[PDB]
Subunit: 245 residues, 4 copies
């Protein structure tokens, strides 16, 4: 199916720019930036939309695919093909960054693929909640942040309201992902996307970071998987209730 | 009225991206930035305009609503419905950030919701003028800065002059709010919006910051409420006098 | 003449965002930035073009007015009316920033309007070349940098080549002024505009900074006045020779 | 041939904004930035596309010219004329920055044009791989990074898929070069362009930096020349296989 390779290609490109920006922020502090993370993932989404926006819609996100189907906009038969396409692309993008930044991660870490400590590198690929946070509040943040993403996504592409001019939606959508990081990313790393979080964390477990990538943060791994699903659905519902009312 | 929920939805979204960016700048200095505050509020306005620009005009600002009515552009009957819509949305967005950043504010402040000191957090939600400033100069800044906002807003949307191409005004308007922060925000925190300032400060008084959120800065709270009203009106007048002359 | 007030209004707005960004960089280092200076002047130009692009062309720059007339594009009779319009607007924008940042400049400087020392403030309004530079190389930089501005301006607005889509030229032009600062501003402060430099420096001499604002840097003041005139003309010539060849 | 001067003019402009941004990052740390390097080269590409996008396509890059010809999109006879046009423009842009930043480089370096040490300046013009890297991994990075550039370039300009709206492709293309730096530039300096790397390094050898500009990094100079050629070709192939499948 053409929507499989479209979701694969757009998610791969998006995650390369994304996870590469995060690797920059962690590895070097003269070449890395939290703002660069916001820009790398944001405008990384802009490139993916140019890749697959006209073929599959360029979801690059299992939450917005789940929310579109659960809202009667995409047939339920296309949910597995969309999810596996972005899961495979995100997995391969994690392997891409790991190999491109290999000696950079090695020299920085001295050869220790660590998840805790002042030299940890697991946070490049997946999300790990800071020490000041609780798992329930991380669920609340991921749900609310994905809700903001879905509500704002509908408004940018709503041809019956006030959408971005066609041919520029790629810009406005990337800017939304930029400011979601700038304004809401410190508390959880704004995963807002199961395809962005679980495939790279699965890669880190196989790569050699071990099993603590899953158990860190009171078994944190499942929250970026199900919390955005509830968030994206809730966000889309509130817009559709806001629209026509 | 549809313009009530439109102003509510756009102001809520705008203030979430706004107050979240400010929380970042205060809480963490590796994930926060004054430029991020400029971007979070700026492109936060961009998302609100996509939400309500075609339904209500996406004022998200009692000064531009007051200036539009006082300039004979919006009927005076729509002033209370617009103001309460953005006041309620801004109030709820302040409660949204407080709950999402709850333990972040607690761990940073040790459990003390303070307004002064090296660990104060009241400045996340509302404006507090720096020690080098006077209340009269804060009135002058808020009036002049809102005047710049209203004059520039008219120019960006003036279909009879040189406006932004339709479908891209959301971008240009956000950029205006970005540079108002970059170029003019240090002296007062560029409130430029009664709906942005008073509802979150009222929330901080109820949340537990106490009554000093109102008395700080020689009873500073009323200036972001009335000074932008005079500024936006003056700014719009000078453009309309500049136009057709 | 309508082009007088258009050049006045657009230059005033541009210089408020410009000189305010520079004041930020000098006064506070948590709220100020060299990148913010690049953004404040860059997208400040974007707002001016929306003000006067359709009425006068939004020159906001005596070099591009001189280059347009000397290239047979604007009648020579409109050179004095354009220059005095932007000179008056830039002068009043310098007075605007000085009054808005008054106590900020006073508290930072302790009450001393100084041009040298670790607490100087004259550099907010006009340009002063660093100690590592020579006056001849400052002439070379201002000429080459204005040449880049004029050549790139023609390309962005050349309806017979590859211009920015109408209604978005304000964006692309501001971005050009951003990167001229980012890439070429350290050596001279990229004045690239007599209207940007001389009127604010004249204001600083009257405001109380004294006469060293003119004599600093081996009588530096005249270079941002005549060097951009030669630069803009040369830059425009090379494009017009490049076009149709 | 008009495509010669078009490639010359666009590459010259692009490299002036590019190499000037890098000079900023190296020479001063209050006026320079790695993000500024990303912006200077990124939106420098935006200006070049406005110069030559409609005349020659604004390649400004021997890898994308090689990839276009090897993919049957540009006649093979136009490969030498395109390459020498951008090589000459990039060479002259390197001489432009060296003369504009002359005393800045001299005062910073005390008069020593050095390639190693805490005061080296050769990295302004060409790429030098960090100490934590291997030459083979630098080949892998330059190939993969140019592949990302070519794949994303096709998607932005594919009139049969989801391209940027005509008249705005200059913006989206520059943004792509920005995030390639933000997300992937630390490991190699993302040369992604033989015309960007070899001509300035040849200039540094003649300027007086000596022969170590070529021998540094296990004879690093040839990798930015041939690795992007393989990368751009591979990236374009994968898109064209992705398209229509």
């Amino acid at each position: 199916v053409r929507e499989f390779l479209a979701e694969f290609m757009s998610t791969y490109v998006m995650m390369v720019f994304g996870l590469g920006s995060v690797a920059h922020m962690v590895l070097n502090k003269k070449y890395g930036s939290y703002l660069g993370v916001n820009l790398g993932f944001g405008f990384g989404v802009t490139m993916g939309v140019h890749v697959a926006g006209r073929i599959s819609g360029a979801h690059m996100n299992a939450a917005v695919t789940f929310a579109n189907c659960a809202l009667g906009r995409v047939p339920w038969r296309k949910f597995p093909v969309y999810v596996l396409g972005q899961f495979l692309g995100s997995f391969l993008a994690a392997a891409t960054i790991y190999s491109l930044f290999y000696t950079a991660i090695l020299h920085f870490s001295g050869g220790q693929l660590m998840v805790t400590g002042p030299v940890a590198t697991a946070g490049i690929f997946a999300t790990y909640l800071p020490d000041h946070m609780t798992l329930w509040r991380g669920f609340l943040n991921e749900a609310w942040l994905t809700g903001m993403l879905q509500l704002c996504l509908f408004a940018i592409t709503d041809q019956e309201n006030n959408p971005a001019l066609p041919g520029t939606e790629a810009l406005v959508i990337g800017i939304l992902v930029v400011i979601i990081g700038v304004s809401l990313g410190m508390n959880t790393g704004y995963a807002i996307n199961p395809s962005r979080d679980l495939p790279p964390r699965i890669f880190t477990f196989i790569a050699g970071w071990g099993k603590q990538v899953f158990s860190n943060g009171e078994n944190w791994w499942w929250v970026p998987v199900v919390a955005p699903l509830l968030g994206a659905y809730l966000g889309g519902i509130i817009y559709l209730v806001f629209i026509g009312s």
